[PDB]
Write a protein that binds this ligand. Structure first.
Ligand SMILES: Nc1nc2c(ncn2[C@@H]2O[C@H](COP(=O)(O)OP(=O)(O)NP(=O)(O)O)[C@@H](O)[C@H]2O)c(=O)[nH]1
Ligand SMILES: [Mg+2]
Lengths: 164, 170
């Protein structure tokens, strides 16, 4: 079957910025792709809609996905609070890579990051499971709101999200 | 005239590096955890009758980025090595921080203070005696703190300043 595509409509203090769409590599990372897909549609009764990109560090990545604590510490998967690292087949080769954030081995939840540069030192520690399809210019625009410690100068949110 | 001190706060994730620093700088505590990337603060204080400008680098409890962490250690003059009294792994982690600091600064005599934080909590796993003995083996002070109640907070940072001053004036 074909890899699913999901979208985020990004807002800045509630004003639309643009749409980012992602190809999810279900063909190579099915369990991790399925988690992100289901969190994007909200079909389990919880997910990304309304949550924030809480940590944006220019030159590195935009990180979000905490819909449970809303403070960068939380999140949960469709499989429970955490799930194991599925594989490390794919690498952090450049801008647009979509990868799981974690707190060490086998702690995937819902937090994720979009690379804005090659982050090869994360290879083998974070599971890569997708890439930006359309809207990299939106991701680049989100960087304007980050800083060296990741704090954002305006609220960058996933105002809407779903499956295409 | 005043004197300036470059202090660096290190220790495992969640032990209270930021809560200690924020209590010193801003005189408040919050139970909400905001994981650190990197933050720096400046505050003027009086220590032993002398005016002191404290530069505090609050580091993250991660170990991955050795190039950056080594530069923190090269620039820093004194190190607050923090563990939590209810986190035995964090206490076991202490010797790694001391070894890294000695390696980077190429010295067996680096100003440092061992801090056992969260002493207000009822869930202690590390005995005070064990930490006292470790500090003695290193030749450095040991101070028990609580960022929540402010116990020992000034004492920990001011003792570190005194250790830098003694080292520089040897
Ligand atoms: N009861 C109590 N809680 C404390 C104390 N110090 C810190 N905490 C709590 O422990 C958690 C982590 O504290 P924090 O200062 O963020 O730790 P850190 O060492 O800076 N973490 P990091 O490495 O991620 O930057 C917070 O919820 C904070 O409120 C303390 O002395 N007593
Ligand atoms: Mg901190």
């Amino acid at each position: 079957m074909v890899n699913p595509t999901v979208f985020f409509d990004i807002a800045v203090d509630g004003e639309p910025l643009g749409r980012v769409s992602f190809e999810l590599f279900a063909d190579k990372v099915p369990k991790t792709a399925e988690n992100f897909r289901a969190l994007s549609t909200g079909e389990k009764g919880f997910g990304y809609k309304g949550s924030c990109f809480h940590r944006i560090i220019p030159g590195f990545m935009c990180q979000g996905g905490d819909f449970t604590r809303h403070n960068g510490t939380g999140g949960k998967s469709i499989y429970g609070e955490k799930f194991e690292d599925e594989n490390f087949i794919l690498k952090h080769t450049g801008p647009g890579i979509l990868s799981m954030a974690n707190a060490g081995p086998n702690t995937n939840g819902s937090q994720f990051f979009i690379c804005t540069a090659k982050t090869e030192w994360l290879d083998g520690k974070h599971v890569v499971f997708g890439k930006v399809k359309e809207g990299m210019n939106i991701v680049e625009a989100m960087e304007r709101f980050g800083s060296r410690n990741g704090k954002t100068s305006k609220k960058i949110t996933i105002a809407d999200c779903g499956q295409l | 005239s005043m004197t300036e001190y470059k202090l660096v706060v290190v220790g495992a994730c969640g032990v209270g590096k930021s809560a200690l620093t924020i209590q010193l700088i801003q005189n408040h505590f919050v139970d909400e955890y905001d994981p650190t990337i990197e933050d720096s603060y400046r505050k003027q204080v009086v220590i032993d009758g002398e005016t002191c400008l404290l530069d505090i680098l609050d580091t993250a409890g991660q170990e991955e980025y050795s190039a950056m962490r080594d530069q923190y250690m090269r620039t820093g003059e004194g190190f607050l090595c923090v563990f939590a009294i209810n986190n035995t792994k964090s206490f076991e982690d202490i010797h790694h921080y001391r070894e890294q600091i000695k390696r980077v600064k190429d010295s067996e005599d680096v100003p440092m203070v061992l801090v056992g934080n969260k002493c207000d909590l009822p869930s202690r796993t590390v005995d005070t005696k064990q930490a006292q003995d470790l500090a003695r083996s290193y030749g450095i002070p040991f101070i028990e703190t609580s960022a929540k109640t402010r116990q020992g907070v000034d004492d920990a940072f001011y003792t570190l300043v005194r250790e830098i001053r003694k080292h520089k004036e040897k």
